Design an enzyme around this catalytic site. Structure first.
Site, PDB file in Angstrom:
ATOM      1  N   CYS A   1      -8.887   9.922   5.824  1.00  0.00           N
ATOM      2  CA  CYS A   1      -8.668   9.643   7.240  1.00  0.00           C
ATOM      3  C   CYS A   1      -7.395  10.288   7.733  1.00  0.00           C
ATOM      4  O   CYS A   1      -7.378  10.974   8.742  1.00  0.00           O
ATOM      5  CB  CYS A   1      -8.518   8.141   7.552  1.00  0.00           C
ATOM      6  N   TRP A  24      -8.203  -2.593  -0.655  1.00  0.00           N
ATOM      7  CA  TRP A  24      -9.072  -1.564  -1.183  1.00  0.00           C
ATOM      8  C   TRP A  24     -10.302  -1.964  -2.021  1.00  0.00           C
ATOM      9  O   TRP A  24     -11.142  -1.131  -2.398  1.00  0.00           O
ATOM     10  CB  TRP A  24      -8.168  -0.639  -1.992  1.00  0.00           C
ATOM     11  N   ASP A  31      -9.481   3.789  14.347  1.00  0.00           N
ATOM     12  CA  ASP A  31      -9.976   2.461  14.694  1.00  0.00           C
ATOM     13  C   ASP A  31      -8.790   1.830  15.444  1.00  0.00           C
ATOM     14  O   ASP A  31      -7.874   1.332  14.817  1.00  0.00           O
ATOM     15  CB  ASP A  31     -10.279   1.756  13.379  1.00  0.00           C
ATOM     16  N   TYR A  50      -5.073   8.511  -1.990  1.00  0.00           N
ATOM     17  CA  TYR A  50      -3.849   9.159  -1.633  1.00  0.00           C
ATOM     18  C   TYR A  50      -2.947   9.316  -2.805  1.00  0.00           C
ATOM     19  O   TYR A  50      -2.698  10.483  -3.100  1.00  0.00           O
ATOM     20  CB  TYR A  50      -3.229   8.401  -0.590  1.00  0.00           C
ATOM     21  N   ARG A  95      -7.768  12.135  11.603  1.00  0.00           N
ATOM     22  CA  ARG A  95      -9.059  12.593  11.967  1.00  0.00           C
ATOM     23  C   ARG A  95     -10.006  11.593  12.606  1.00  0.00           C
ATOM     24  O   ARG A  95     -10.893  11.938  13.386  1.00  0.00           O
ATOM     25  CB  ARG A  95      -9.718  13.199  10.740  1.00  0.00           C
ATOM     26  N   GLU A 110       0.743  -1.260   0.000  1.00  0.00           N
ATOM     27  CA  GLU A 110       0.000   0.000   0.000  1.00  0.00           C
ATOM     28  C   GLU A 110       0.800   1.356   0.000  1.00  0.00           C
ATOM     29  O   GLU A 110       0.286   2.397  -0.429  1.00  0.00           O
ATOM     30  CB  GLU A 110      -0.956  -0.115   1.191  1.00  0.00           C
TER      31      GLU A 110
END
Ligand code: UFP
Ligand code: UFP
Lengths: 315, 315
Positions: B198, B82, B221, B146, B218, B60
């Protein structure tokens, strides 16, 4: 006591001081990353081991919820917090014929009557801003500033989206979003700017009937600056609970680089020998409710009892 | 020991737990605001009281410095981080005729063979993505993600500005800017999005020949997520020192809302009875230098010794 967060963060910068040659080098002690939280239900964070003029703070936020761009509205509120960014375009073309003010911050500080000849053409300008509805319109719209980035994110398909109004219909429709973040950072025209957003963004939050607001401040001037910021956003937090009809909770100030300009080192030492007083309670005009449409008489600070005002070498 | 930051922040969420009905309510314990710092010179923060698959993390990021938008490059790296955001547009028009997968995350978890009929049309799709250079091109470009917001801030006068390349010519021309901040938040099309950024932004920093990187996240988890993030940006910090030729320093992870989904509470308890091991050392291919142009064989993790992998109820 309550303002104790603020007051510790000059202690760590002394004792962790990374000495950065940055400025025109000039001298700084920094750190990198810092959070420091504040209980807004305890009392309002106006600094009591220094005297921080509450007027110029709200005179500047009410510039900010009015969506306002204009030096004229702050001037006619005795607010001189922004002048030189628009006096930077007096030393810029035509009408400007025959003083200098070439990068004047510097030579006024290293002046005697330079600061004063700058203090007299600058003044000429300020009172133009006051009286002619077109020169004013010209030099005075600063354009990319908070009132604009708050109240008119300018899009591709040239719309204006007001981040503030939408995020508080989101606190009114939906209390628990992890997405109530307003962001003053526009990467497009960040490198076409003069001073990039210092207050980069702010997240808000609804826990137990009550609200908090979190701030990423990308750079901060510990002495000659921060006392002011603590109040600007801790008053903000207070006025959007006034529109959502919730309670007040916490102002988290979180930092990226926080520094202490080295010319100020004697002076921060002194108020660190001061002993805190209690802190005032800020109370807003109840019956009126749009913060966006607030004037001055709509926030009274009561029982504020500062120590004397410590003088600048500016920042 | 070293990962101790992470491990405390499940302790405070238990002991500070605000229980939020958010999700489809479903259940969460949150907090609001948290910073927690990491010494990247101590060792690399891969979690040793759980086994966190280092492969899918770099698979990633290397999606992310490649500026890449495409599910195809991650798939052909066994990366299944994803899928469903682009399988959300399989349950979307034409070719999609006659399974359902209507808001499928839900009924697969509350399934037996639904998760499996979804697991078989989803799979059909994934291997299309693999083999036909036009369907793939269609469902697979996720667009705002991103790789795109990193490597192509899309402007009004439709240019693409790559925040990452500019900020690291800024760390190479100018070490001390308080303005090395890349921001994934675009307010224009934040409310036209599915999952808003995020990781909202990251500031970088050069103190003493060495570099740090700070993260405003922001929402997070805590269990089923954060272990992963700690590494994704603590590896990032490591590869841009590799391009600027500096040293490694600190990864500050700072938080806005951090929560612990209530379905997971038994499971976080257990690895909190685990005792840390030492943490691996990440070392990058020396001789090659563009991180942007790195493959897989260019980061080896060594002596990583996890405890067993604790199983999901997903998040
Ligand atoms: O109250 C203030 N606080 C603050 O942090 N700045 C800053 C920080 C830094 O010293 C300078 C801006 O530089 P840069 O944008 O490079 O951080 O002004 C200005 C104020 F008026
Ligand atoms: O590792 C992860 N960490 C994380 O914080 N999210 C989140 C957080 C929240 O639980 C949800 C997104 O919701 P919202 O965008 O409303 O925060 O997914 C997802 C991941 F995969």
């Amino acid at each position: 006591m309550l303002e104790q967060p603020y007051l510790d963060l000059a202690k760590k910068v002394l004792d962790e001081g990374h000495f950065k040659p940055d400025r025109t080098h000039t001298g700084t002690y920094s750190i990198f990353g810092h959070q420091m939280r504040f209980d807004l239900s305890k009392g309002f964070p106006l600094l009591t081991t220094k005297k921080v003029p509450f007027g110029l703070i709200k005179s500047e936020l009410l510039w900010f919820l009015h969506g306002d761009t204009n030096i004229r509205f702050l001037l006619q509120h005795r607010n001189h917090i922004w002048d030189e960014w628009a006096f930077e375009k007096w030393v810029k073309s035509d009408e400007y014929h025959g003083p200098d003010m070439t990068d004047f911050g510097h030579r006024s500080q290293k002046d005697p009557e330079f600061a004063a000849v700058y203090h007299e053409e600058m003044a000429k300008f300020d009172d133009r801003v006051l009286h002619d509805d077109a020169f004013a319109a010209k030099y005075g719209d600063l354009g990319l500033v908070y009132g604009s980035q708050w109240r008119a994110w300018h899009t591709s398909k040239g719309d204006t989206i007001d981040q503030l109004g939408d995020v508080i219909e989101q606190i009114k429709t939906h209390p628990y979003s992890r997405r109530l973040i307003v962001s003053a950072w526009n990467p497009e025209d960040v490198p076409t700017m003069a001073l990039p957003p210092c207050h980069t963004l702010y997240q808000f939050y609804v826990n137990d009937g009550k609200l908090s607001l979190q701030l990423y401040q990308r750079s901060a001037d510990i002495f000659l600056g921060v006392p002011f910021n603590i109040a600007s956003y801790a008053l903000l937090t207070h006025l959007v609970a006034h529109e959502c009809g919730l309670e007040v909770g916490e102002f988290i100030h979180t930092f990226g680089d926080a520094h202490l300009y080295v010319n100020h080192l004697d002076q921060i030492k002194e108020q660190l020998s001061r002993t805190p007083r209690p802190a005032p309670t800020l109370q807003l005009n109840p019956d009126k409710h749009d913060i966006f449409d607030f004037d001055m008489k709509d926030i009274k600070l009561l029982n504020y009892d500062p120590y004397p005002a410590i003088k600048a070498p500016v920042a």
